[PDB]
Amino acid sequence: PEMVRGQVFDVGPRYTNLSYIGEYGMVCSAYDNVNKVRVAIKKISPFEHQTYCQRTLREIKILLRFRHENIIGINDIIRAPTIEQMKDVYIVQDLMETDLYKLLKTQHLSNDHICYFLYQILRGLKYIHSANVLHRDLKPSNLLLNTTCDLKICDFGLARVADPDHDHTGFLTEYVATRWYRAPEIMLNSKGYTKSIDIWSVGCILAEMLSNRPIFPGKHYLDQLNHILGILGSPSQEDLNCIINLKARNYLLSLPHKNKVPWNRLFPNADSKALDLLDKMLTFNPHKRIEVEQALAHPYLEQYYDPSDEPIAEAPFELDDLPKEKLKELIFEETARFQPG
Ligand SMILES: NCc1ccc(-c2cn[nH]c2-c2c[nH]c(C(=O)NCc3ccc4c(c3)CCO4)c2)cc1C(F)(F)F
Missing domain, CATH: 1.10.510.10 (Transferase(Phosphotransferase) domain 1)
Structure with missing residues (x-):
């Protein structure tokens, strides 16, 4: 469980040697052990407010469907294996x-x-x-x-x-x-x-x-x-x-x-x-x-x-017209394709 500027930033075994960038949630740079290139990782904690959930979801939905040189991609999404344990969502993007x-x-x-x-x-x-x-x-x-x-x-x-x-x-x-x-x-x-x-x-x-x-x-x-x-x-x-x-x-x-x-x-x-x-x-x-x-x-x-x-x-x-609870499930389901399972 890696710590960055007094905050939990556990991106697992794949991403290491973290460095802070800026800031809802935090963003860090990290080394990807699979592709061997440094990447950017955005930790988001949106489950409290449904607006933060709505913004998280529409962005995830759009960026997973988009593939273009002049648009940021989503290379990987790191999160807990279950909805219950899912407190944060880590979006891995272009550094x-x-x-x-x-x-x-x-x-x-x-x-x-x-x-x-x-x-x-x-x-x-x-x-x-x-x-x-x-x-x-x-x-x-x-x-x-x-x-x-x-x-x-x-x-x-x-x-x-x-x-x-x-x-x-x-x-x-x-x-x-x-x-x-x-x-x-x-x-x-x-x-x-x-x-x-x-x-x-x-x-x-x-x-x-x-x-x-x-x-x-x-x-x-x-x-x-x-x-x-x-x-x-x-x-x-x-x-x-x-x-x-x-x-x-x-x-x-x-x-x-x-x-x-x-x-x-x-x-x-x-x-x-x-x-x-x-x-x-x-x-x-x-x-x-x-x-x-x-x-x-x-x-x-x-x-x-x-x-x-x-x-x-x-x-x-x-x-x-959608609650932060239903949106949590939608964020969980949209990020399923990146899990090691
Ligand atoms: N210091 C500003 C800054 C500058 C560059 C970058 C950066 C560098 N490489 N890739 C990125 C990047 C990757 N994704 C994004 C990215 O998604 N930025 C927008 C954004 C939207 C919502 C949100 C946050 C950010 C943090 C908490 O909630 C930027 C990130 C940031 C940061 F921290 F704002 F996200």
């Missing part, structure tokens, strides 16, 4: 040296790195969206990188099956995903049940790669929309006409006119092709926002674009 959040705090990214990082994000996202899945929490800390800059999308805890026919909601509807990467429609009339929600987050990531600073660092729920409008400018009549919800539309109408800040003023050193694609991802109207495959076909990514080498899921992919 990655850094993440884009860490890189952006101290490293100037060359245009070539920005181009390559964006390509891999969108290549991974093409696969996710082809499975009818939305990631819903794309941000630099959810983009892992190795020493050769291979990028992998991680954390599918907030991921959902796309549901565009049930995307509408009222004004100022509470939302869970990281504030700075929230599309403007979340604060106005959207539940984040469409693919266009992830494209917005990738647009934010691209802008952040260009200046090493989040483009819309909102300090609270409605401040997030004010940051977006301060750069995009006031929505056009057309874009306002698409917002039928009276409270959302009238909030936008109450605001003084704001002019669009040109992308090349905000980003004076950026490549013009990168700013043209940025513009199409950071489009106010989600219906006019570029889609992942169009983004991959954009001239900025021409050196990498190869749709034959951009795989899609072999098949498309209720947990809302």
Whole structure:
């Protein structure tokens, strides 16, 4: 029973020589005695709260069905042999040296790195969206990188099956995903049940790669929309006409006119092709926002674009009203395939 930073981390005989990383549950690096490579292991203890169970399950379900170079896999799942003895679940994944959040705090990214990082994000996202899945929490800390800059999308805890026919909601509807990467429609009339929600987050990531600073660092729920409008400018009549919800539309109408800040003023050193694609991802109207495959076909990514080498899921992919007890059993059953039995 190996101990790490005053906590039980018993990953069995297979995984040894542990080192702490970060933090519900803990994450450590370890040596895999079967494959002889160092791996990353995430201990999760979610059985108290059903939300933590719901996030654990949907991620396990999605990552076991997914197989893509730019998406984190689940190599192994370590847990007790019985439901009764199962207090923790250890998810074994790809070990990655850094993440884009860490890189952006101290490293100037060359245009070539920005181009390559964006390509891999969108290549991974093409696969996710082809499975009818939305990631819903794309941000630099959810983009892992190795020493050769291979990028992998991680954390599918907030991921959902796309549901565009049930995307509408009222004004100022509470939302869970990281504030700075929230599309403007979340604060106005959207539940984040469409693919266009992830494209917005990738647009934010691209802008952040260009200046090493989040483009819309909102300090609270409605401040997030004010940051977006301060750069995009006031929505056009057309874009306002698409917002039928009276409270959302009238909030936008109450605001003084704001002019669009040109992308090349905000980003004076950026490549013009990168700013043209940025513009199409950071489009106010989600219906006019570029889609992942169009983004991959954009001239900025021409050196990498190869749709034959951009795989899609072999098949498309209720947990809302479900107790933490039933979810414990579902986590136990989904992790059965990894047991030595
Ligand atoms: N210090 C931040 C950080 C940085 C890199 C990594 C890392 C390195 N190689 N692989 C990973 C990695 C593997 N899986 C994940 C991973 O699943 N990260 C997201 C996540 C979601 C829920 C949750 C936790 C994390 C911990 C408790 O509850 C990241 C992990 C983390 C960590 F600790 F946040 F998970």
